[PDB]
Amino acid sequence: RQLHLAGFFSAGNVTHAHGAWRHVGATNGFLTGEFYKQIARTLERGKFDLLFLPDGLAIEDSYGDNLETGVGLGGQGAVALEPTSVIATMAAVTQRLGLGATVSTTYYPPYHVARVFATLDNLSDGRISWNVVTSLNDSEARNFGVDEHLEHDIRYDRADEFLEAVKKLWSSWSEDALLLDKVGGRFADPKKVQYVNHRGRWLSVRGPLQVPRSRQGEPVILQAGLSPRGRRFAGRWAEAVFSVSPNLDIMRAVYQDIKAHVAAAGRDPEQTKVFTAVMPVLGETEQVARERLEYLNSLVHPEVGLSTLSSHSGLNLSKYPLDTKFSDIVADLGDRHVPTMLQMFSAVAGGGADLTLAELGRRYGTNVGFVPQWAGTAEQIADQLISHFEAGAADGFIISPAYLPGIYEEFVDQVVPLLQQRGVFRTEYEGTTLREHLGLAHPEV
Amino acid sequence: RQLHLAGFFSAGNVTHAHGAWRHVGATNGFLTGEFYKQIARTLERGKFDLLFLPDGLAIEDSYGDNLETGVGLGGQGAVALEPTSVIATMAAVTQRLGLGATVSTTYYPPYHVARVFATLDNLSDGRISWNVVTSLNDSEARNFGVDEHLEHDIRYDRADEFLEAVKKLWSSWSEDALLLDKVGGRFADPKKVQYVNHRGRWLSVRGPLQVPRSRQGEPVILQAGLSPRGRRFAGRWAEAVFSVSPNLDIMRAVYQDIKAHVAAAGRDPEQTKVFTAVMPVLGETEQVARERLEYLNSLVHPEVGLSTLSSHSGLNLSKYPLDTKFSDIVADLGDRHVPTMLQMFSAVAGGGADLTLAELGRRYGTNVGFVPQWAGTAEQIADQLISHFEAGAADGFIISPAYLPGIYEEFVDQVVPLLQQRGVFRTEYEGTTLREHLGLAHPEV
Amino acid sequence: RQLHLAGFFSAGNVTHAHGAWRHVGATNGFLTGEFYKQIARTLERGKFDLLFLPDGLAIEDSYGDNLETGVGLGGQGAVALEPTSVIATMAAVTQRLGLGATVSTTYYPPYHVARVFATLDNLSDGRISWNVVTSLNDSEARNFGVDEHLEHDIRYDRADEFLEAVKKLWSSWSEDALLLDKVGGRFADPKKVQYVNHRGRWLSVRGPLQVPRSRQGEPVILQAGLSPRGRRFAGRWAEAVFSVSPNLDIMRAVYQDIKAHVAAAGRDPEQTKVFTAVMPVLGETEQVARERLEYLNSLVHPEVGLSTLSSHSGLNLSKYPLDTKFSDIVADLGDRHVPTMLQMFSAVAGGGADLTLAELGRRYGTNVGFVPQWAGTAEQIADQLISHFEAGAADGFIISPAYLPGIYEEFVDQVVPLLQQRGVFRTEYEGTTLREHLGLAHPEV
Amino acid sequence: RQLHLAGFFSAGNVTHAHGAWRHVGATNGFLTGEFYKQIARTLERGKFDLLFLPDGLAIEDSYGDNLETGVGLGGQGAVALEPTSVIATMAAVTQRLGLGATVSTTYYPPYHVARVFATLDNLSDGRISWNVVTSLNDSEARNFGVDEHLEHDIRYDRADEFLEAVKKLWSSWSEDALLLDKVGGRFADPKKVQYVNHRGRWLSVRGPLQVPRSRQGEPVILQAGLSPRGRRFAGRWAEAVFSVSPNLDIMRAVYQDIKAHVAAAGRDPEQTKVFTAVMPVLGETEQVARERLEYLNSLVHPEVGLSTLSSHSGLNLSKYPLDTKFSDIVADLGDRHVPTMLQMFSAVAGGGADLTLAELGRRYGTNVGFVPQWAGTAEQIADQLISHFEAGAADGFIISPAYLPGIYEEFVDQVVPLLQQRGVFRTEYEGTTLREHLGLAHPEV
Ligand SMILES: Cc1cc2nc3c(=O)[nH]c(=O)nc-3n(C[C@H](O)[C@H](O)[C@H](O)COP(=O)(O)O)c2cc1C
Ligand SMILES: Cc1cc2nc3c(=O)[nH]c(=O)nc-3n(C[C@H](O)[C@H](O)[C@H](O)COP(=O)(O)O)c2cc1C
Ligand SMILES: Cc1cc2nc3c(=O)[nH]c(=O)nc-3n(C[C@H](O)[C@H](O)[C@H](O)COP(=O)(O)O)c2cc1C
Ligand SMILES: Cc1cc2nc3c(=O)[nH]c(=O)nc-3n(C[C@H](O)[C@H](O)[C@H](O)COP(=O)(O)O)c2cc1C
C-alpha cells in the first residue's frame, strides 16, 4: 500500500501561508521561468505524482472593495500568472511529474478547455490534469466581464454538460486514427476521426478536436469543491480530489463521504484518489522546527489574513474596526447572518476565546484556517504522513509550501527518502503517465 | 544595416508546403515537446530574431464540407495544437529567441489575451509576441459554438478597441510598483497599480491585470492581414508585420504601402518591421537544390492542394471532376463571379496554360500560391536575401520550412554564417528582449 | 534480433572524410560545448546505443616532420580535444546514450584510467565505455616526455596486465559496501572495500579506488585494433569491437574471425558485439545522393589524405614527389618492404591501376581507404544496413559522419524510423545502462 | 568595489564539516551527475565567481594505514571522484560560473595538465581554472606506483618549471591562427602555430598543444599552499589564492603577506585575488542558527577528525591512546619535535587547556581547525562578510558548505540578495569569462 504525493502552489505571491513572500528564504521568483522550473524539477527528483496550480482571475478587491490591502501587503491573487502557461513551462523540463491547472467551467467554452489540455497532454507525453472548478466571482466577472450570474448549484449542473462536451471532444480521434503513411499518402483514417455534434441545453460544440489523444488517452480529471453539490459532482467525474481538513476525524469523514459518492454514481471508489493538504515545517530538531513555524506564522499581517477570511466567508469584515471582538459581530448582525463556517472558525481558532477581527484574520492567514501545520523533524513528518495514511485519512497528501522554493528542497531531501525506506512511497516512477502514477485506468474512446 | 530573420510553421502537420509531412526527412514530431524544443533551440543557435505560429480553430472541412480530404490526406489544420502552450514550451528551453503566437480578437476576451501574453512575457523574460488576427469563419465558430457574423472590416474596428483594452491592462502595473520589501511588509505600492475601468462600444474590462510588466514592457504586436482595412490596422498597431509576396515587385509595393500607413497613423515607420516569407531549398550545388525542390513539390497530393485553394478562394471546387479544366470553371460561374485571387493564381501558375483542377490544386499545394520558392546553394540564398533586402523588399525574412525540423538545421548551419560574414546579420544577440532584437523602443506605462 | 547503432567522430576537425571541415554544412563547432551537446542529444533522439571518440595525443607531424600540412590544411588531429572531458560534457545533457573515449594503455597509470572512467560511469549513471588502445608513437611520446620503446605485440602483453589491474580497481568496492547509515554513523562497510595490492611484471597499484561501482557495475570495454595480436586482445577483453571493412564479404570474414577469437578465449561470443563502420550519404533521390557524395569527395586535398596514409602505413611518403607512381615506390622498396595494407589499398582503389601518390592520397583522404561510402535514399540505406546485418556483417554499425553535426540529423530523421518500422531497431530504450542497450551481462565483483 | 564569492567542496562525502554526510538534509548524491548540476546551477543563480574542487589520489588511510576509520566512518576522501570530469559536467549546464579543479604537479606530466585544462577552457567558453598543488603522499604515490620522494620545497621548485612548461603549451596557438577558410582550403596559419620543445632540469615537452586558446586566453591559475615556499610560489604564479584563517587578525596578515610576495615577484598585487574560507550556518533567527550549528557539530566522530588530522599534521596519531593527553604526547617528540600548525591549533582550541587527543580530533573534524564557523541570520552573515571585507580580510570569500546541496540553496536564497542590495556584490554577470569575473587581464600569447 503506497501513498501519493502532490505539490500545490499559486503561480504568484501567496498560497496558504500569507506571510510566505516575506520569508527570509523566499526568492519571490514567481514572475520568472526559472522559479517554476526549479520547483518542478525538485518535485520530480522527489518522485512526486503531481504538481498543480490553483487559479482566480481577479486580484481580490473583494475585501472590502479594495486592492490597497491585497496589492500593498501581498494578499491572495495580488500576482497571479495564467496557470496553463506555467505548467507548459514546467512540462518542458520534466519527464515524469504530473502537472495540473485549475480552470473554471464558467469562463471558457468547452472547445477551448478541451484543446488546451489535449495540447498539454500531448506536449507532456500524457502527464496532464485539469482541475475542474465551477467558480463565478463578479470581479472575475468584471475582468472577463460577463454578468449573467448563475446560482452555485446550477453552475455544477452546467458543468455536468461541460465535462461531457469536453470528453466527447477528447474522443474525436481514435488512438489508431493517425497513420502517417508517407509512401501511400494516407495521413489519417478519416473513418476513425468523428464529428462531435453536441447540442445540449447549455452548450454547443461541433468538432472534431484537431488534437489527437496522448499515451494516457485523456487528461486526468482533478476536482476541487466540497459543497454538497460539489461532492455529487465529484462522485460522477473526479479521478482525483483536492481536499483540505484540519484533523484526522474530518479527513476520514471527507474520505469516506467522497468514496461513497463515487460508488453511488456507479464508479469504482478505488479509481478516485483523495488527496488532503498538509503544511509541513521541518527542523533538525523538533525545537528548531517549532521555532521556524513560529517565525513563519509571525509574518502574517492581520489585514491580509482578514481579507482572505472575508473572501472565503462571504462576509465583508473590513467594515469594522480591527479590534471588534467576534461576539460583537454576532451581536451586531444576529447569528442568522454570520456564516457558520465563520462561527466555527472563530470557535476552533480561539479555543473558546472571544477574538478580535485582527487576531482572527492573523490566525486565518497562517494556514487559511484549515490546512494543518505540522512542525517536526523529517522522521516525525514521515511518521505523521504514514500514520494518517494508515488511519485512512487520504490516498495521498498535498504538500502546502510554507515558503518557495526552499521548502520543497527540504521536503524532498529529508522526508521523501525516509518514506521510501519505509516502503510506503515509490523509489522510482513505475510508468511514464500521470494515470500510471495514480493507478488509474487508461480510458477508451 | 542588418536584416532580421524569423521562423514560422504551424504546430501541426502542414504549413505552406502541402507535401511536407510526406518528405523523407519529416519527423512529424508535431505532437511532442521535443520537436518544438529542437526547432526553437536551432533557431536560437542561428541568432534568429523570432519564431511565431499561425492558428486555426477548426479542421478545414469546406471542400466540400468533409473530414475525408483534410484528415485522410493531411490538409490544413488536420492537427493543430493550441499555439500559446507550444511557445511556452519553447520559451522554457531558450533565453534569447523571440516567440509569437497567433490569436484571434474574435474568439477571446481582451482580459484573457492580455493575461496569457503578459504571463508568457514574464515567463520568457521579455521575449513574447502576440500576432493579432481578426478572423472569423463558420467552422471555428461552430466549434466555439457561436452565432455571429461580424463583417470583415467591422472585425477590425472592434479590434482597435480590443488592442486599446489589452494595452490598458498591460499598463495596470507601473514598472516600479513591485517592492517586495520583506522587512517592512510592503509588497507593492498600490498607488502604482491602477484599475482599468474600460467601457467602450465593443468591450468592457475592469482590471487591474494581475501580472506585472516584463523587462520589455509589453509584448511585441505582430500583425497579419493585408486587406485594405488590415493595412490601416497595421498602420496604427503593428510593430512587426507578417507579409507574403510572390515576387520582388509586390514585396516592394506592400513594403512601401505599410510604411506609408504607419506614417499616416502618426507613428515612426522604422518602428514597424516588415517581414516577407520565402521558402528556401538548399543543395551543395544548384543542381542538387533544384532536384530537392522538385522532389519536395512532387509530394503534394492534388486534392489536398485543391482543398486549401477552395478555402482561400471562397469557392468549393470539390463539386467538379478533377480533370475539369479551369476555363470550364470560368464558363460555369461567369468571369465576373470568379474571385480575383483565383484568376490571378491560375494565370500565374499556369503561365497562360489551361490547367485541370487537379493540376491547379497540386501547384497551389506546393507553396500556397504566393510563397516564393528559392532553390540554390547557401551562397546563392544568402545573395538573394541580401539583394532583396537592399532592394527594399523587407526589413526581414520569414523562413517558411519545406519540411521539419531538418530544413532549419540546414539553414542555420549553411546560410546564417554567410550572412554573418557579410555583416548583414547579427553574429550575436546584442540584447535580451524581443524589442531589442527588432530595434523597437521600450514602451512607457 | 535487433541491430545496434553507434556514432563516432573526432573531437576536432576531421574523422574519416578529410574534406569534412570544408563542407558547406560543417559548423566546425568542435571547440564549443554546444556542438558536442547537440550531436549527443541527436543520437539519443535516434536511440543510438553509443557514441565514442578516437584520440591521438599529438598533431600528426610524421609527414613530413612538420605541421605545415596537418595544421595548414586541417589534417588528422590538427585540433584534438581531450576525449574524456568531451564525453563528460555529453553525459551531462543525455540520460540513455552510451558514451566512450579512446585512451591508450601506454601513457597513463592504471589507477588514473580506472578512476577517470569509474567517475564518468557514476556521473552518467552507468553509460560510459573505455575504448582500449595500445598505441605508442614518438611524437605522442615527445609530448609526454617519454623515450620509451616497446614493440607492437608486447604493448598488448603489457595491456593484459593493465586491464587486469584496472578491473581489480573497479572491484575495490562491493556493490553493497556503501551504507550511508546517518543515525548509526556508519558510512560504509570496511570489509567490503578492499585493497588491490597489484604487483605484476609491468605495473604496481595499491588501491583501493576512491570510486564505487555504478549501476552497470563496470564501464564497457570497447577495443580497436585489428592486428593479429589485436584480435587476440579483443578476444580476451573486448565487450564491443570497432572494426572497418570495405565490403560485406570482408565484413563477414572479420566478423567470424573476432567471434572465433572470443570463443577461443573461453568467452561467450554473443557477449562481444562487433561494429563495422560505414559512411552514409543520403539524398531524397539516389541521383541527389550520388551528387552529394561527389561534392563531399571533391573537397579532399591530396596532401592531407597522403599525410594520413603515411601515418597508418608506417612509411612516410612525404619524401617522395606527388607524381611518384605507385609501382616505382615498390621498385625502390621491394615487394618485400612496403606495408601490406598499403597496396591492398592501391589495388583496391584502381581495382587494377597505377595512380600517382597524389591520387592515392586523395582517394585515401575520402574514407581512410577502407570505410565504405554508401550513397542512396533513406530506404536504400536502410535496406543495405538490414541486408548486411541479416548477412552477418556485424552486430551493429558505426555511422561515420561525412560532416558535422548535419549528417547525424539526416540519418536520425530519415533512416532510423525506417529501421524501427521494420522492427530491426529499438523504437525506445528498454534499459538505462550501456550494458542493457548492448545486451551485456552486469559483471560481478 | 565589490567582493568575490566562490564555492568549494570535495567531489565526495566530506569537505571540512566531517559529520556533513550524516546531516538529515544531506542527499549524499556525490556519485550522481544531478547532485553536481544542481549545486553549479545554484551558485550560477547566485552569481558566484567560481566553484572549485580539491583532490587527493588515494583514500585517506594514514591513520592508521587501514581504511576502517576513513571508510567505516566517512572521513575525508573516502569517496573522491576525479575532479576534472566533475567540473566538465558542471560546465555543460552552466554558462557564467567559473570552474576550477585541483591537480598535483607531482603525478601528471605538464602536457596532460595543459591539454585537459585547455580542453575544459574551450568547452566552457573561457570559465575554467586550475588549482595548482604540489602534494606528494605515500598512499597516493603507491596508487601511481611511484617511488621517488622529493623534499617539500623542491617539489615547488619542480613546480616552477612545470608551470612554465604548461604556459608555453597554452601559447602554441596564436589567437588568430585558426582560419577555417573553407573556400580556400586553409584550415590554420602554420606560422602562427609554434613548436615548444621545452627542455629544462625536470621536464621535457615537445608541442605544439592540439588545443587553441579560449575566449579568456588561458585558464586562471588558482593556488593552495601556505608554507613559506608555497607563498613564494603563489607570488610568482597565482592569480587567485585559497586561504584559511581562524580570525580577522590572521586573515589580514595572511592577506598582506600574500600581496607582498606577489609584489616581490614583480607582479601587480591587484591582479592576484585572495579568498578566505568561512563556514556559515543560517537560521531564520540567531537562536535557530546556533542550534543548527550545534546539531551539525554534534555529528562529528572524534576519530574521523583525527584520521584526517593525522594527514594534515602528517604525523600518525594512530597509535597513541585516544585519551592521550596532548601535551604528554608532545613530550616524546620534544616541544621542538612538534609540527607547528598542529601546535597553533592546540592553541586555537582556544581554551589553552590540556586536551584529549579524542577532543583535538573532534574539533579538527568540525572545521579542519581553522575554518571559522559563523552562525546567524542572513543579515548577520551578510554584515560579517561585508565588515570583514572592508577590514581587508580578503578580496573574496570561499563558502565552505556545512552540508550539500542544501546550504548553498539557503545561502543563495537568503544572503546573496542582501549582499546585492548593499551594492557589495554583483546583481548580474558583467562578462562571460572567469577572468572578467575576477577582474583579471587577458594574458597575451
Ligand atoms: C480544497 C479546495 C480548493 C479550491 N480551489 C479553488 C481555486 O483555486 N479556484 C476556484 O475558482 N475554486 C476553487 N475551489 C472551489 C470554490 O469553492 C468555488 O467557488 C466553487 O464554485 C465552489 O466549490 P464548492 O463545492 O466548495 O462550493 C476550491 C475548493 C476546494 C474545496
Ligand atoms: C501573411 C498572412 C498570414 C495570415 N495568417 C493568419 C492565420 O494564421 N490565422 C488567421 O486566422 N488569419 C490569418 N491571416 C488573416 C486572414 O486573412 C483573416 O481571415 C482576417 O480576417 C482577414 O485578414 P485580411 O486583412 O488578410 O483580410 C493572415 C493574413 C496574412 C496576410
Ligand atoms: C578501427 C580502428 C580504429 C583505431 N583507432 C585508434 C585511435 O583512435 N587511437 C589509437 O591510438 N589507436 C587506434 N587504433 C589502434 C592502432 O592501430 C594502434 O596504434 C595499435 O598499437 C595497433 O593497433 P592494431 O592492433 O590495429 O595494430 C585503431 C585501430 C582500429 C582497427
Ligand atoms: C587552503 C589550502 C587547501 C589545500 N588543499 C589541498 C588539496 O586539496 N590537495 C592537495 O594535495 N594539497 C592541498 N593543499 C596544500 C598541501 O599543503 C600540499 O600537500 C603541499 O604539498 C604543501 O602545501 P603547503 O605549501 O601548505 O605546505 C592545500 C593548502 C591550503 C593552504
Author numbering:
A (entry chain B), B (entry chain A), C (entry chain C), D (entry chain D): 5 to 449
Task: Show sentences the authors wrote.
Then, DBT sulfone monooxygenase DszA catalyzes the oxidation of DBT sulfone into 2′-hydroxybiphenyl 2-sulfonic acid (HBPSi).
The binding pocket is mainly formed by IS1, IS2, IS3, and IS5. The most substantial structural discriminations were observed at the side chains of residues Phe56, Val137, and Phe246, which may facilitate the binding of FMN. The binding of FMN to BdsA is maintained through hydrogen bonds and hydrophobic interactions. Based on the structural analysis, six single-point mutations of BdsA were constructed: V137A, S139A, H156A, R159A, Y160A, and L230A. The results of enzymatic activity showed that mutant proteins V137A, S139A, R159A, Y160A, and L230A completely lost their activity.
